[PDB]
Amino acid sequence: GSSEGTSCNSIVNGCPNLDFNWHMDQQNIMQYTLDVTSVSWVQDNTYQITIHVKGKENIDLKYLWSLKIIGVTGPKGTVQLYGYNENTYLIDNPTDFTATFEVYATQDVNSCQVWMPNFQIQFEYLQGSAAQYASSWQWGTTSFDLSTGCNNYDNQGHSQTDFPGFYWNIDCDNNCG
Ligand code: NA
Ligand code: NA
Ligand code: NA
Ligand code: NA
Ligand code: NA
Ligand code: NA
C-alpha cells in the first residue's frame, strides 16, 4: 500500500555560524560539507531525507573501501553506501554524493519544527583492495567518522561536530503557524 509524501518547503541549517572546519582540521581530515536537500514526511514521525555531501578536493572512487551512515535514528540504524563486503555500490564519488534514507525526527525546535536526529558518516579509504593506491593519497586521515549536529561546540564558536544539524516542519505541514 502506497502513500502520498508531504514535502517540506523550509529546511533550515540550525547553526550556520559555527566553525565546522576546525573539527576536521584538528584531525587532519580533509574538509567536507553536508546539506539536507529534501525532506518528505512519510507518516508517524518518519521523514525521508536526502543529503548531499561534498569534499573540498575530488577523491577518486578507487581510494574508497567503505562508506556508511551510522547512528541513524530511523527504521535502519545503518545505511550502507559503499562496500565490497556488503555488495553495496550506491555512490560513485566519495567527495560528491547523495543519499536518501528515513529518520525519526521528534525533538522540537519549537511547536512547528523538529530537529533531524544526528548521525555519522564513516569513511574508510585505503583499506582492503584500495590500499594499493596509498602512494598517491594526499588528503590526510584515511579512516574517520564525520558527525552532524548543532549541540556540541567549544567556547570559541568551533563545532565538535563536522556538519550542521538541520530542522524542518513537523509532518511537513508548511502552514504550521
Ligand atoms: Na507535498
Ligand atoms: Na527526501
Ligand atoms: Na544499508
Ligand atoms: Na532546540
Ligand atoms: Na523554541
Ligand atoms: Na578555552
From Swiss-Prot:
Disulfide bonds: 8-172, 15-150, 112-176
Effect noted on mutating residue 82 to D: Disrupts homotypic domain interactions
Domain Flo11: start-end pairs: 2-177
Post-translational changes noted in the entry: Extensively O-mannosylated.
Note from the entry: In the reference strain S288C, the transcriptional activator FLO8 contains an internal in-frame stop codon, leading to impaired FLO11 expression in this strain.
Domain comment in the entry: The number of the intragenic tandem repeats varies between different S.cerevisiae strains. There is a linear correlation between protein size and the extend of adhesion: the more repeats, the stronger the adhesion properties and the greater the fraction of flocculating cells.
Protein name: Flocculation protein FLO11
Part of the intact protein present: 30 to 206 of 1367
